Amino acid sequence: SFETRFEKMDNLLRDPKSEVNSDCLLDGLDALVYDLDFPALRKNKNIDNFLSRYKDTINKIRDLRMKAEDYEVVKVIGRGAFGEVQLVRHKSTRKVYAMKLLSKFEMIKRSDSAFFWEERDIMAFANSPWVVQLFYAFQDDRYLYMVMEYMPGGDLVNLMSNYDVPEKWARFYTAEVVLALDAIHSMGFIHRDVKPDNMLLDKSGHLKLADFGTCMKMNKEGMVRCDTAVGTPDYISPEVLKSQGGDGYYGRECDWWSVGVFLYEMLVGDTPFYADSLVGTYSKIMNHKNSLTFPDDNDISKEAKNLICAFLTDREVRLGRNGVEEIKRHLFFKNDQWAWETLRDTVAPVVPDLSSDIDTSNFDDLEEGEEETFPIPKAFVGNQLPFVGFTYYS
Amino acid sequence: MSFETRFEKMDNLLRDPKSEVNSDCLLDGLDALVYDLDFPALRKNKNIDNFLSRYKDTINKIRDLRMKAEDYEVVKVIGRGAFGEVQLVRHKSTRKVYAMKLLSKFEMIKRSDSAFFWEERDIMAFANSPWVVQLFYAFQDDRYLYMVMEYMPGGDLVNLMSNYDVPEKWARFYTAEVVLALDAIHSMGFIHRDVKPDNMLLDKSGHLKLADFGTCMKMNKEGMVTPDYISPEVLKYYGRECDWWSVGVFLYEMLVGDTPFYADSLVGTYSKIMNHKNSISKEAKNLICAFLLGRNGVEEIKRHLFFKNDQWAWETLRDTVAPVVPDLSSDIDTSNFDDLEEDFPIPKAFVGNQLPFVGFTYYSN
Numbered sequence: 001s002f003e004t005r006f007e008k009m010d011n012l013l014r015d016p017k018s019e020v021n022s023d024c025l026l027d028g029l030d031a032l033v034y035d036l037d038f039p040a041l042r043k044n045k046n047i048d049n050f051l052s053r054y055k056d057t058i059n060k061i062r063d064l065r066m067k068a069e070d071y072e073v074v075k076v077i078g079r080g081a082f083g084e085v086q087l088v089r090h091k092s093t094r095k096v097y098a099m100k101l102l103s104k105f106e107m108i109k110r111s112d113s114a115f116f117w118e119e120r121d122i123m124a125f126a127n128s129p130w131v132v133q134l135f136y137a138f139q140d141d142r143y144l145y146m147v148m149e150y151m152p153g154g155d156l157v158n159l160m161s162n163y164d165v166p167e168k169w170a171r172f173y174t175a176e177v178v179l180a181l182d183a184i185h186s187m188g189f190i191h192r193d194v195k196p197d198n199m200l201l202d203k204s205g206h207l208k209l210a211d212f213g214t215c216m217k218m219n220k221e222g223m224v225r226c227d228t229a230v231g232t233p234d235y236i237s238p239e240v241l242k243s244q245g246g247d248g249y250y251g252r253e254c255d256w257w258s259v260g261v262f263l264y265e266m267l268v269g270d271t272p273f274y275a276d277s278l279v280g281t282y283s284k285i286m287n288h289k290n291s292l293t294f295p296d297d298n299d300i301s302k303e304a305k306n307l308i309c310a311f312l313t314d315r316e317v318r319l320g321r322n323g324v325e326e327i328k329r330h331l332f333f334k335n336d337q338w339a340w341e342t343l344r345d346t347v348a349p350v351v352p353d354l355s356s357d358i359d360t361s362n363f364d365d366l367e368e369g370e371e372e373t374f375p376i377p378k379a380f381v382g383n384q385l386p387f388v389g390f391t392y393y394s
Numbered sequence: 395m396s397f398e399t400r401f402e403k404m405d406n407l408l409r410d411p412k413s414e415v416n417s418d419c420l421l422d423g424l425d426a427l428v429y430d431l432d433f434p435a436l437r438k439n440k441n442i443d444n445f446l447s448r449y450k451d452t453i454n455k456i457r458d459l460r461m462k463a464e465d466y467e468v469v470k471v472i473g474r475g476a477f478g479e480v481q482l483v484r485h486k487s488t489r490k491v492y493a494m495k496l497l498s499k500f501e502m503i504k505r506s507d508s509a510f511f512w513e514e515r516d517i518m519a520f521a522n523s524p525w526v527v528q529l530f531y532a533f534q535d536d537r538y539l540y541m542v543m544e545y546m547p548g549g550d551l552v553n554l555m556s557n558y559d560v561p562e563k564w565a566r567f568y569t570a571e572v573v574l575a576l577d578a579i580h581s582m583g584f585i586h587r588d589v590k591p592d593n594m595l596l597d598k599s600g601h602l603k604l605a606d607f608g609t610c611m612k613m614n615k616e617g618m619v620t621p622d623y624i625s626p627e628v629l630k631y632y633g634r635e636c637d638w639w640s641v642g643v644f645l646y647e648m649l650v651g652d653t654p655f656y657a658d659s660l661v662g663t664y665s666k667i668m669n670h671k672n673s674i675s676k677e678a679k680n681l682i683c684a685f686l687l688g689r690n691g692v693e694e695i696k697r698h699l700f701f702k703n704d705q706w707a708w709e710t711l712r713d714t715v716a717p718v719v720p721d722l723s724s725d726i727d728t729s730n731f732d733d734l735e736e737d738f739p740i741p742k743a744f745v746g747n748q749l750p751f752v753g754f755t756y757y758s759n
């Protein structure tokens with residue numbers, strides 16, 4: 001039908017979740033100009049006639065649509081594998097944001113050019129207080145940019161380093177992670193990277209997850225198949241650690257292992273499977289039945305020890321294997337202060353004392369090293385193609 | 395400048411039908427990219443493979459949704475050109491009757507003539523003049539370019555001169571219509587470069603309107619930019635005066651019966667044009683020699699003694715009764731059109747054969 005055709009056709013161009021969205025279609029024309037404008041390629045009569053027709057307008061569009069120049073970089077608050085997070089202020093609106101830039105070169109070289117898609121969807125369409133919001137997503141020939149919600153309270157690895165965390169506080173932050181992970185599992189995702197570095201605090205001192213670059217969409221049975229181990233050497237689970245070609249089948253239970261590791265470091269001060277060599281950690285995780293030992297001097301309760309050991313076991317005997325309510329039911333979470341249904345509405349243990357909209361007291365100082373860039377191509381390579389459709393505004 | 399104002403201007407370019415980076419033109423890019431990249435040799439590239447696995451499925455969904463040649467039923471082949479043909483079509487859903495021009499993408503890539511259609515597109519789509527054949531829809535596939543236009547049931551002026559012994563009264567009318575038609579094209583900043591009776595078509599009322607614009611070119615700076623109708627200055631930048639030469643050639647052929655510079659060999663015609671100085675009314679002769687004038691303005695042409703008549707006025711010429719009005723029995727009547735017969739390689743690396751056609755798609759209203 002003619003009428004039904006243009007109803008669906010126009011639906012595909014305004015939809016923010018659509019692959020062929022208005023802002024995603026421009027990314028194609030933009031990447032094409034980036035990848036074709038070279039002397040060797042310009043020798044082609046077809047490539048030359050395209051560039052002479054679209055280079056003029058594509059430059060005007062480059063100035064109009066969101067660019068890195070529109071943002072005033074205040075301070076580098078974080079640093080990752082493929083980039084760094086900066087505290088930015090938009091030059092026109094004067095709004096304060098946290099911007100994460102991802103190196104397109106480091107992504108092409110290391111063949112890791114697909115991890116950002118799930119993170120882009122989760123942050124933009126989560127609609128949960130447990131997830132750091134993504135306001136704008138843009139790009140250029142060199143980087144991918146993610147203009148997100150700024151967390152003035154800082155990361156949790158900054159909290160345990162600056163405070164001697166008691167059990168009362170540990171009870172709160174663990175319960176927040178449990179509720180936050182359940183929200184991610186509700187969207188049908190396994191985080192595969194639960195660590196205090198990814199847990200960030202807002203202006204009120206409440207927890208919300210931030211790095212969703214290790215997330216995977218769960219199947220109808222709540223499982224996932226992976227030929228590659230992903231996470232952090234200390235927080236990684238034994239079933240997801242040995243995950244290789246053939247034997248790489250696991251559910252959401254691997255995310256509960258990382259909660260136990262987190263609670264241990266929160267109370268003991270060190271990770272449970274820490275070793276001076278990275279291979280030593282690997283062997284300790286697989287031998288958790290004999291490797292997991294608590295220090296002789298204890299500030300920690302019997303129920304906290306039970307909750308750690310309930311999480312730090314084999315997948316088939318691990319806590320949370322039969323719903324999230326199984327975890328909520330544990331004796332360690334039984335308290336007089338808060339309730340599960342209204343946990344984010346109660347007062348946080350630490351509330352950040354903020355003097356200005358650009359306060360970075362909770363983030364420890366970092367150096368602002370030279371990077372590599374793509375060589376000129378002798379023929380079409382299309383290095384900008386795996387990034388087409390990343391641009392988001394809504 | 396400012397954030398809020400940048401989003402308004404960016405949204406304008408996306409909706410604007412005259413814009414190069416229009417909504418329908420942006421899809422052409424993604425469409426051409428899938429056409430040119432989906433090959434085994436190219437799919438060996440990790441970047442090309444990851445793009446196609448992500449966009450080929452959704453682009454095929456769009457190809458079905460967007461306008462196709464399958465949406466129209468071909469009634470009769472009314473015309474034929476160098477790179478294509480003109481067919482009388484009926485849109486299967488709306489049942490509307492149109493004239494559809496096809497252009498071979500292979501013939502354009504081979505012969506290197508992959509830019510002539512751009513002026514033909516802009517003139518027809520954004521003219522908003524009764525003197526220009528309207529373009530309703532413009533679409534494409536991996537094989538052709540399609541131009542869904544206004545159908546002219548009255549036919550071409552070549553058929554008129556062949557079927558009627560054209561008197562001066564008729565010649566005065568059709569010449570004045572061409573003059574008003576060319577003035578409208580010059581107003582848009584375009585020079586025809588090939589004004590001939592084959593390009594002049596008649597509507598249901600018998601009124602003239604120009605159609606073939608493959609020889610046109612946009613005016614450089616102020617106003618500067620095929621045989622026998624070719625002007626000597628073209629032969630060798632020239633202005634809009636070259637189109638007025640072709641009007642005189644047209645008026646001559648309409649009254650005499652033959653072209654003024656006709657020769658049995660094509661080479662002979664070329665020499666006769668350059669030697670125009672040596673190669674049935676006095677006022678008709680005065681006009682033919684005047685064009686062989688109009689350099690200053692169009693009013694100079696209108697104020698000639700040949701155009702002085704009791705029948706029509708220059709301001710209301712298209713509103714008066716035409717000399718010949720086509721007798722049409724049906725919406726698919728092709729009596730004024732003479733009958734005609736009904737009837738690339740896999741790349742080893744990126745060639746981008748669909749790239750000079752990106753941005754051709756147009757949808758009116």
Ligand SMILES: CN1CCc2nc(NC(=O)c3cccc([C@H]4CCCN4C(=O)Nc4cccc(C#N)c4)c3)sc2C1
Pocket residue numbers: 077078079080081082083084085098100101102112115132148149150151152197200210211213214
């Ligand atoms: C192995 N492959 C799969 C997954 C993967 N993943 C990557 N990731 C990165 O390259 C990266 C860059 C900058 C920053 C971060 C992380 C780690 C440090 C803090 N951070 C925040 O995103 N912080 C934050 C996030 C949101 C808001 C605020 C604030 N305020 C801070 C990560 S390469 C890569 C490759």
Ligand SMILES: CN1CCc2nc(NC(=O)c3cccc([C@H]4CCCN4C(=O)Nc4cccc(C#N)c4)c3)sc2C1
Pocket residue numbers: 472473474475476477478479480493495496497507510527543544545546547595605606608609
């Ligand atoms: C060297 N280069 C110069 C520019 C150029 N140009 C070309 N041209 C073509 O390929 C072509 C195809 C079909 C039809 C026509 C022309 C000539 C015959 C009729 N016609 C109508 O366009 N007719 C009409 C146009 C609009 C409405 C109706 C009706 N009814 C009829 C031309 S190759 C070429 C290459």
